[PDB]
Write an enzyme that holds these catalytic residues in place. Structure first.
Site, PDB file in Angstrom:
ATOM      1  N   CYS A 159      30.578   9.767  26.690  1.00 65.61           N
ATOM      2  CA  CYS A 159      29.210  10.001  26.256  1.00 65.61           C
ATOM      3  C   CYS A 159      28.331   9.302  27.286  1.00 65.61           C
ATOM      4  O   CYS A 159      28.775   8.318  27.879  1.00 65.61           O
ATOM      5  CB  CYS A 159      29.005   9.321  24.901  1.00 65.61           C
ATOM      6  SG  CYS A 159      30.123  10.005  23.631  1.00 65.61           S
TER       7      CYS A 159
ATOM      8  N   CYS B 200      -7.017  -4.692 -22.130  1.00 64.32           N
ATOM      9  CA  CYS B 200      -7.860  -3.620 -22.662  1.00 64.32           C
ATOM     10  C   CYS B 200      -9.338  -3.697 -22.150  1.00 64.32           C
ATOM     11  O   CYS B 200      -9.966  -4.750 -22.127  1.00 64.32           O
ATOM     12  CB  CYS B 200      -7.821  -3.621 -24.217  1.00 64.32           C
ATOM     13  SG  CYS B 200      -8.535  -2.123 -24.978  1.00 64.32           S
TER      14      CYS B 200
ATOM     15  N   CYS C 239       0.825  -1.213   0.000  1.00 60.04           N
ATOM     16  CA  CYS C 239       0.000   0.000   0.000  1.00 60.04           C
ATOM     17  C   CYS C 239       0.859   1.262   0.000  1.00 60.04           C
ATOM     18  O   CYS C 239       2.018   1.292   0.336  1.00 60.04           O
ATOM     19  CB  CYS C 239      -1.040   0.091   1.100  1.00 60.04           C
ATOM     20  SG  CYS C 239      -0.407   0.446   2.804  1.00 60.04           S
TER      21      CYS C 239
HETATM   22 ZN    ZN Z   1      29.551  12.073  22.951  1.00 61.04          ZN
HETATM   23 ZN    ZN Z   2       0.336  -1.450   3.982  1.00 64.41          ZN
END
Ligand code: ZN
Ligand code: ZN
Ligand code: ZN
Ligand code: ZN
Ligand code: ZN
Ligand code: ZN
Ligand code: ZN
Ligand code: ZN
Length: 306
Positions: free
Chosen positions: A229, A272, A116
């Site tokens: 981090c 067709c 879809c």
């Molecule tokens: Zn970082």
């Molecule tokens: Zn879907």
């Protein structure tokens, strides 16, 4: 329209996928005077140049080749035909959400897998995010069937127009970004920036500058700091169900239909939609879909279906 077979991407003013109107002209003089021998029955018939023949109705024209083109169906006047997009008249379930939707996009893998259009958008957006578009030297960047089938890259890249202006623009930037990434660089993480940056390999601090001035840590992509981090799984049964040519349950629309005039049952043997009744004394010409005499509205909205 009663029924639309064709979709085009309409630039101004719809900026969206719209039903398309098929037209035909003489390839020689370019007038609407080419009478076809045989109506089109598939996309190849209306895309390959000079494939279809007829007679130019001018006394001044010797032209015998048709040239087809499309117009947006949503308004009076040339947009590009989205040939992978089909009306889902047999209620085929979508490969990824398993709902029945229409229209649908049908991949050119051997299985002719069906997705879809909302799932196609989400496919595209997920792959853009994750840098999983596929490169082809003869094309640029594109996507294959979602199931991963071989030889199924989308080649008519105007289909990505259906994503709408913003995501299509991200798709159009992808190649240049990917060049930076494959060279070991990094994209600026600032929303609305994404500049491609090529800092020296070993520098953790990256500043968006020639950009937006943002200084970021290239490891975690947050603002630069010292110190440390702080979708892809296609169901096998869902894929088998979602195939264009797979056997289907009978719908309300039958596959053998009575002649609108003589009532005798009539089999359809090609794409067709202009039917000629096989009965010697009937010979009615009629639209398979609409059950009426053949006419230019039916030509333009659904000359053929797939
Ligand atoms: Zn970082
Ligand atoms: Zn879907
Ligand atoms: Zn339009
Ligand atoms: Zn002509
Ligand atoms: Zn496939
Ligand atoms: Zn930036
Ligand atoms: Zn008949
Ligand atoms: Zn019709």
């Amino acid at each position: 329209s009663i029924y639309n077979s064709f979709y085009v991407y309409c630039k101004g003013p719809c900026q969206r996928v719209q039903p398309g109107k098929l037209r035909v002209q003489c390839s020689t003089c370019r007038q609407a005077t080419l009478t076809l021998t045989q109506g089109p029955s598939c996309w190849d018939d209306v895309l390959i140049p000079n494939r279809m023949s007829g007679e130019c109705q001018s006394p001044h024209c010797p032209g015998t080749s048709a040239e087809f083109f499309f117009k947006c169906g949503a308004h009076p006047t040339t947009p590009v035909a989205l040939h992978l997009i089909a009306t889902n008249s047999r209620n085929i379930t979508c490969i990824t959400c398993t709902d029945v939707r229409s229209p649908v996009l049908v991949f050119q893998c051997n299985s002719r897998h069906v997705i879809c259009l909302d799932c196609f958008h989400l496919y595209c957006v997920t792959r853009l995010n994750d840098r999983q578009f596929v490169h082809d030297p003869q094309l640029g960047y594109s996507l294959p069937c979602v199931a991963g089938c071989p030889n199924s890259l989308i080649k008519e890249l105007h289909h990505f127009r259906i994503l709408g202006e913003e995501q299509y623009n991200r798709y159009q930037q992808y190649g240049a970004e990917e060049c930076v990434l494959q060279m070991g660089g990094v994209l600026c993480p600032r929303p609305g920036c994404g500049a491609g940056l090529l800092p020296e390999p070993d520098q953790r601090k990256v500043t968006c500058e020639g950009g937006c001035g943002f200084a970021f840590c290239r490891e975690c992509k947050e603002a630069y700091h010292e110190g440390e981090c702080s979708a892809y799984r296609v169901d096998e049964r869902a894929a088998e169900q979602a195939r264009w040519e797979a056997a289907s349950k009978e719908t309300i629309k039958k596959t053998t239909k009575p002649c609108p005039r003589c009532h005798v049952p009539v089999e359809k043997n090609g794409g067709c939609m202009h039917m000629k009744c096989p009965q010697p004394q009937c010979r009615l010409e009629w639209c398979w879909n609409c059950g009426c005499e053949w006419n230019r509205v039916c030509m333009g909205d659904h000359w053929f279906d797939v």
